[PDB]
Write an enzyme that holds these catalytic residues in place. Structure first.
Site, PDB file in Angstrom:
ATOM      1  N   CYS A   1     -22.675 -24.348 -59.540  1.00 39.01           N
ATOM      2  CA  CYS A   1     -22.146 -22.848 -59.190  1.00 39.01           C
ATOM      3  C   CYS A   1     -23.118 -21.782 -59.481  1.00 39.01           C
ATOM      4  CB  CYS A   1     -20.839 -22.810 -59.843  1.00 39.01           C
ATOM      5  SG  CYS A   1     -19.669 -24.246 -59.262  1.00 39.01           S
TER       6      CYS A   1
ATOM      7  N   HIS B   1     -18.437 -14.306 -63.291  1.00 41.03           N
ATOM      8  CA  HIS B   1     -18.425 -15.485 -62.617  1.00 41.03           C
ATOM      9  C   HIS B   1     -16.862 -15.722 -62.038  1.00 41.03           C
ATOM     10  CE1 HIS B   1     -19.681 -19.468 -61.087  1.00 41.03           C
ATOM     11  NE2 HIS B   1     -18.538 -20.055 -62.083  1.00 41.03           N
TER      12      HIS B   1
ATOM     13  N   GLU C   1     -15.390 -17.214 -70.202  1.00 46.75           N
ATOM     14  CA  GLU C   1     -16.317 -15.870 -69.626  1.00 46.75           C
ATOM     15  C   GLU C   1     -15.990 -14.825 -70.615  1.00 46.75           C
ATOM     16  OE1 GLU C   1     -16.489 -15.148 -65.480  1.00 46.75           O
ATOM     17  OE2 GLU C   1     -18.200 -13.968 -66.114  1.00 46.75           O
TER      18      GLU C   1
ATOM     19  N   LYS D   1     -14.810 -13.283 -56.252  1.00 41.94           N
ATOM     20  CA  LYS D   1     -14.272 -14.609 -55.727  1.00 41.94           C
ATOM     21  C   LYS D   1     -12.760 -14.298 -55.467  1.00 41.94           C
ATOM     22  CE  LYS D   1     -17.331 -17.931 -58.055  1.00 41.94           C
ATOM     23  NZ  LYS D   1     -18.188 -16.807 -58.592  1.00 41.94           N
TER      24      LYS D   1
ATOM     25  N   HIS E   1     -15.033 -19.072 -53.396  1.00 42.77           N
ATOM     26  CA  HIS E   1     -16.191 -19.662 -54.297  1.00 42.77           C
ATOM     27  C   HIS E   1     -17.029 -20.322 -53.099  1.00 42.77           C
ATOM     28  CE1 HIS E   1     -18.419 -21.184 -57.382  1.00 42.77           C
ATOM     29  NE2 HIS E   1     -17.288 -21.955 -57.932  1.00 42.77           N
TER      30      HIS E   1
ATOM     31  N   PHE F   1     -20.935 -26.014 -63.177  1.00 46.07           N
ATOM     32  CA  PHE F   1     -20.489 -27.351 -63.728  1.00 46.07           C
ATOM     33  C   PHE F   1     -21.812 -28.151 -64.364  1.00 46.07           C
ATOM     34  CE2 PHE F   1     -17.009 -26.974 -60.787  1.00 46.07           C
ATOM     35  CZ  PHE F   1     -15.944 -26.596 -61.817  1.00 46.07           C
TER      36      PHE F   1
END
Ligand code: O6Z
Ligand code: O6Z
Ligand code: NA
Ligand code: NA
Lengths: 413, 413
Positions: free
Chosen positions: A168, A308, A319, A337, A342, A401
């Site tokens: 990502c 993010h 985060e 997002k 995403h 990830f």
């Protein structure tokens, strides 16, 4: 050595392009976001009913890539290569089709996976009719560097064509490495960003089985709720995004009008878990800190964080801790997002473009669906209406990830 | 700013590990190469006769990775992740299991593709039993950053975990980016190199339909003939390879004896062809030149070139032009793919380890099968028996599908 102290050359963003669930035109996406528009809808694809998928929501591109692709391109390129060619052409036209030195021109384009549909196609063709049914073009379409390679060939970049993979964060990491290639003196100009494949049944199944994805199917536009107490995972939103970066001297020489400055990039790793982010957010915070060190900024300088913010329970909590560790918790926070969903390998690049437009226009769009504050978050989340301000410096966050942390520091031009 | 003038910190290689078609022990591979051994054999796999493949030769690993993998590792990792973990542990033990600062420790590991076999497994499982038959572990095994992530988690690297993908140059590009991460001050120590999947039916089908592979099935050990008149394409030879690099001060502090110096890295691109190198070798030559600029060396200083030397007609012709363009045509040349074959994303890393051993031991192994030197190529190709010589500086060349050129400059410690 820093951007501030002249240790690194000044690097400017001179053009941006993106295709999203809202529009194929980035200026139209931007106007839509500021008006509180969502790209997320009920999926009408037959595969949703075929497999009775738990997830029945997402954002397909407003303008499908393959509507612009001839028969040769449909046969000789994977989907991410076709997206790469389309965006590469659009970006170069937007930049005024400049005649640059190919030997000083680099391409850095990240992606999550590559031409994966050509792997399954090659597998099926060989099982059906043997090895001679596999395309002579299979390798060059499958290889994850394929999109970067197509854009490099298209535009004539001979100062390096690179593809970082970090799930990502791939799209942000590509911009980080493009910045490094310029400040280390290997290139004066770079096309950089991220591309990603479309929403399909197997991708939905794979991310769904991690419990990473929202199943709020009754209200698709309300499903993506980054930092909200009632969040239940991420929503797929298709995208691709490229920007043109070059030295300030290079831009001035060709009379290019800069949109923003790219000041610094920080890359760290959690070494914590294969999919869970570190709860303490310390290494993620340190990525933000490193981008400030290389920019020559202090945390007090950061007016804005482009989060993010995937809207997973564990992700948003980590985060929020990272932004606190970096000393940036007084910054205005946007989670795009919430509106665009995403796009995995593309999303860091898309959000970098949105960060550039925030600084250019002095406005942060509203984080959609932010209705119930979460005590564990305690951030200044922009919500309800766009926030206008004299924004000087911003950090774009992108995490992957595997525990990959990328922070990009941008400045108003 | 160069390594020579102290503009960059001194970076040393302190440990190496590799698994090859000759041996699982890099020192035993090295002794085998010096003895004129080949890892290339007739493929005895059932799939060769099942599919009647055009290619019936290659080098499987002497010691298969999965002979060292318990049931848990077979269920939670892709093949390239299992290879990565195996080599990561071996390298750390070889380095004396050092206690380093995790926040100054980076991992950069290249690969051609990633956990692709888990894509086709997940596809088959879903087609047979629906979306809930896809594993919650699928994404983390499939994602091409997976092997680097596994090594980062295994060893505790928190200063970045990066995966460059550039097909056959991935393993060299990983070492280039690890060197960059240290000289830019993001890390003091890095595990770097390349991993790649095994020889299987679909890989042979895809690469052989490109028309790039040798079909000398009757004489497997004679098939890989880099720079030879009778060369007819490349031969698969399985490998993975990692090295430990760190600042000379970091090595000295923990009493690590350096094997070699890593002095500089050049990354350029052809922007000409998708699967063949540019015939003129000019951008490939510029990658070598860039490595020398950053090292602070002249072409006259280069005693040895570890060629890409794939044994394609165009590949060896283009590389001969590249070496001449870079002014390195008086260097002693070795083409290790003559003996170890081609491991795609791993091979640049493997050949970097061989370059280190050449400098440490003052010896170049013989290029196998160099019996009728190509009349149109005039290089000093080491052949017959190993050449003992005063090798002070060497360049390792790697080129990748997509037009990627990577050169690494190494020095004797
Ligand atoms: C925003 C949706 C992304 C889903 S992904 O992460 O799985 N990427 C991807 C890559 C290549 C592909 N080829 N065909 C489908 C497809 C999906
Ligand atoms: C030297 C042999 C290389 C063949 S490759 O380039 O196709 N790599 C590869 C990657 C992942 C894989 N999963 N299963 C098989 C396999 C092969
Ligand atoms: Na962001
Ligand atoms: Na080489």
């Amino acid at each position: 050595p820093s951007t501030a102290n002249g240790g690194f050359p000044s690097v400017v963003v001179t053009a941006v392009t993106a295709t999203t669930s809202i529009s194929p035109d980035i200026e139209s996406t931007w106007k839509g976001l500021l008006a509180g528009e969502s790209g997320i809808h009920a999926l009408e694809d037959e595969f949703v009913t075929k497999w009775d998928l738990a997830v029945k929501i997402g954002g397909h591109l407003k303008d499908p890539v393959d509507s612009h692709m001839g028969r040769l391109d449909m046969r000789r390129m994977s989907y991410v290569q076709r997206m790469g060619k389309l965006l590469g052409g659009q970006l170069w036209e937007s930049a005024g089709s400049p005649e640059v030195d190919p030997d000083r021109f680099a391409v850095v384009v990240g992606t999550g996976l590559g031409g994966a549909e050509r792997i399954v196609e090659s597998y099926d063709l060989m099982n059906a009719g043997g090895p001679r049914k596999v395309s002579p073009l299979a390798v060059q379409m499958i290889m994850p560097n394929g999109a970067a390679a197509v854009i490099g060939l298209q535009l004539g970049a001979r100062a390096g064509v690179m593809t970082p993979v970090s799930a990502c964060s791939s799209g942000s990491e590509a911009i980080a490495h493009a910045w490094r290639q310029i400040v280390m003196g290997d290139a004066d100009v770079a096309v950089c960003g991220g591309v990603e494949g479309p929403i399909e049944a197997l991708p939905i199944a794979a991310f769904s089985m991690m419990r990473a994805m929202s199943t709020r199917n009754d209200e698709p536009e309300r499903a993506s709720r980054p930092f909200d107490k009632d969040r239940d995972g991420f929503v797929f939103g298709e995208a691709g995004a490229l920007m043109l970066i070059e030295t300030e001297e290079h831009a001035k020489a060709r009379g290019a009008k800069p949109l923003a400055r790219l000041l610094g990039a920080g890359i760290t790793s959690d070494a914590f878990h294969m999919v869970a982010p570190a709860a303490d957010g310390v290494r993620a915070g340190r990525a933000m800190t490193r981008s400030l060190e290389l920019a020559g900024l202090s945390p007090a300088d950061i007016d804005h964080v482009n989060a993010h913010g995937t809207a997973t329970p564990i992700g948003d909590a980590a985060e929020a801790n990272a932004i606190r560790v970096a000393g940036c918790d007084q910054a205005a926070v946007y989670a795009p997002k919430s509106a665009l969903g995403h796009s995995i390998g593309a999303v860091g690049a898309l959000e970098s473009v949105l960060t550039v437009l925030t600084l250019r226009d002095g406005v942060i769009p509203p984080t959609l669906n932010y209705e119930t504050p979460d005590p564990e978050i305690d951030l200044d989340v922009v919500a309800g209406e766009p926030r206008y301000g004299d924004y000087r410096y911003a950090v774009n966050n992108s995490f992957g990830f595997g525990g990959h942390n990328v922070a990009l520091a941008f400045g108003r031009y």
